[PDB]
Design a binder for this molecule. Structure first.
Ligand code: NAP
Length: 307
């Protein structure tokens, strides 16, 4: 009851640690508190720090490698087939592990090799078939025990599924009460792809965007009625909707709080109330589209209208 089974047979722990903007001390505290699933990415710039933490905790016998589920992601400048395996090798060196449990294509949009941050002149025409074939080679050599995608629309996931030899195990997408992804859940379920919810508390976007989740009136009502925090309700909502959740916190207290989502539930009469929450996507990926210089000319193209 505390995992989702992937199409490879692997067990993905229901709650993963979000590591964007996290420092080593908080990652170590999270594992001590009980996190086993760790959501990483090369672009977060902290994989080396994370590797130091994993090396220490595994070395001390706190956890065995097999108790952890480590995800990383292929950044958009590394989409070309020659670069894919080099990117994972760097990630494995930094994380001080021999394999990741899950490796994801971070975005369906590609960038020139020389670039790191997405800018219009750096956008390139993607070739997800070729990138996926390279991902499949990493799966075949056990460097990534499962392979998947992130930020793929229903259409882009369908298009990949139509060419893939190895079915993507996971599609990691923004998902929270303000962006519920009902249609994509249906598609993923029907194809045996696990949907994993990023930014489950409403994201780290500036201007307190996350308050649209953490202080939504329905979320707040349900929290009051159940005697739980709004973060707890948002996370439990996600689990009950059938996706994993990847909450990030730099606070030990909040890390602990965010794991207390198993021993209680949201009753159906309250769960149904979430259907009336206004819907908005917070991670809009404007940086991966451009009218003149982009492959995707608009974000509506990038998301195939799922925005
Ligand atoms: N694949 C992708 O393109 C993609 C995109 C976005 C995110 N992700 C992944 O998803 C993870 C989570 O998303 P996210 O980092 O955007 O943020 P999030 O998990 O939605 O929310 C984090 C924010 O909420 C605060 N918070 C955490 N627990 C709280 C609690 N119990 N009560 C009140 N506030 C709380 C955090 O602040 P404090 O740290 O100050 O507590 C932080 O500002 C990321 O770290 C990353 O691993 C992936």
């Amino acid at each position: 009851i505390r995992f989702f089974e992937l199409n490879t047979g692997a067990k993905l722990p229901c709650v993963g640690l979000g590591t964007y903007a996290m420092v080593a001390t908080a990652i170590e505290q999270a594992i001590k508190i009980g996190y086993r699933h760790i959501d990483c990415a090369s672009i977060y710039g902290n994989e080396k720090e994370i590797g130091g933490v994993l090396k220490k905790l595994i070395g001390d016998g706190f956890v065995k490698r097999e108790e952890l589920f480590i995800t990383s992601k292929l950044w958009s400048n590394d989409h070309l087939p020659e670069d894919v395996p080099k990117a994972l090798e760097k990630t494995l060196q930094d994380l001080q592990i021999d394999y990741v449990d899950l490796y994801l294509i971070h975005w369906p949009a590609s960038l020139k090799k020389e670039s790191l941050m997405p800018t219009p002149e750096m956008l390139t025409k993607p070739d997800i078939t070729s990138t996926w074939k390279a991902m499949e080679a990493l799966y075949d050599s056990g460097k990534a025990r499962a392979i998947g995608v992130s930020n793929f629309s229903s259409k882009k996931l369908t298009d990949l599924l139509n060419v893939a030899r190895v079915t993507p195990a996971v599609n990691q997408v923004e998902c929270h009460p303000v962006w519920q992804q009902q249609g994509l859940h249906e598609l993923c379920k029907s194809k045996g792809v696990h949907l994993s919810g990023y930014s489950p508390l409403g994201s780290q976007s500036k201007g307190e965007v996350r308050l649209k989740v953490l202080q939504n009136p329905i979320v707040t009502e349900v929290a009051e009625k159940l005697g739980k925090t709004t973060a707890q309700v948002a996370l439990r909502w996600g689990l009950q909707t059938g996706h994993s959740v990847l909450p990030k916190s730099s606070s030990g207290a909040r890390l602990k709080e965010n794991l207390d989502v198993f021993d209680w539930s949201i009753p159906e009469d309250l769960f149904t109330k979430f259907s009336n929450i206004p819907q908005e996507k917070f991670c809009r990926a404007t940086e991966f589209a451009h009218e003149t210089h982009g492959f995707y000319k608009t974000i509506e193209e990038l998301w195939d209208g799922e925005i």
